[PDB]
Amino acid sequence: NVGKKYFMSSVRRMPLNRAKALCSELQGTVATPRNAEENRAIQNVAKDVAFLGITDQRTENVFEDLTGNRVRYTNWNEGEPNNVGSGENCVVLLTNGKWNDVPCSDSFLVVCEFS
Amino acid sequence: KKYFMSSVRRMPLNRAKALCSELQGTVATPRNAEENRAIQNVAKDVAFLGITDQRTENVFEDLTGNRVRYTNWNEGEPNNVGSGENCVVLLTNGKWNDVPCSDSFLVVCEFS
Numbered sequence A: 001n002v003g004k005k006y007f008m009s010s011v012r013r014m015p016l017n018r019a020k021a022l023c024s025e026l027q028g029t030v031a032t033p034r035n036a037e038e039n040r041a042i043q044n045v046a047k048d049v050a051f052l053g054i055t056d057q058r059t060e061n062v063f064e065d066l067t068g069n070r071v072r073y074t075n076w077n078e079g080e081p082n083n084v085g086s087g088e089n090c091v092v093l094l095t096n097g098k099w100n101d102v103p104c105s106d107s108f109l110v111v112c113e114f115s
Numbered sequence B: 001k002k003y004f005m006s007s008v009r010r011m012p013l014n015r016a017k018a019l020c021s022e023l024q025g026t027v028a029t030p031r032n033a034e035e036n037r038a039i040q041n042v043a044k045d046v047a048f049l050g051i052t053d054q055r056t057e058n059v060f061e062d063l064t065g066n067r068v069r070y071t072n073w074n075e076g077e078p079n080n081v082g083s084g085e086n087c088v089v090l091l092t093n094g095k096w097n098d099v100p101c102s103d104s105f106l107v108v109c110e111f112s
Ligand SMILES: OC[C@H]1O[C@H](O)[C@@H](O)[C@@H](O)[C@@H]1O
Pocket: A080, A082, A084, A088, A100, A101, A102
């Protein structure tokens, strides 16, 4: 927890569409760090690489949260985002806390955020 | 402290357990009136609590097998109607009712 936000991690891996459904089921959303403190809190609850609620699906290289709000704070791993291969429009938080853009169809743990 | 969150969909207890455990929580088990009211605050309709008498009839335990102390049964409950009611839901007035574990209700998950 950070301020009014609570972060919980999943135990199993799944693609972002399913991750979204899971957090939405309990009326939360996929975790979106707004500052370094929240980034650390999310990293701490995630025991492995996990999805964040950030994507550039609507407009390439324009990252926004799942409610359409452009993100301000970012913590990209060196070399990212790189939209490699056929494209990478979702975002995961690596085990060192930095971010990587990855295919939304790939599976990772999910960290959900509740307020 | 404990944090309570309600589901949007209705499901039987086994699925409710699976949902809460997916985010490393458990089905809400109020230990006093304050927590019972906190669960009421988040549940918009009848919802499962993490309590059952599946082991021994009329002996209620939380999902980890710990016998509960605080209870808030609705008048006339628990009545174990018909083929049996071994699960528990929080009614919209905050009182509890024992119901079939196979019936579907909203679920309130608990995290600490
Ligand atoms: O070299 C880093 C590169 O490795 C893989 O290709 C994927 O994880 C990419 O998302 C990442 O950018």
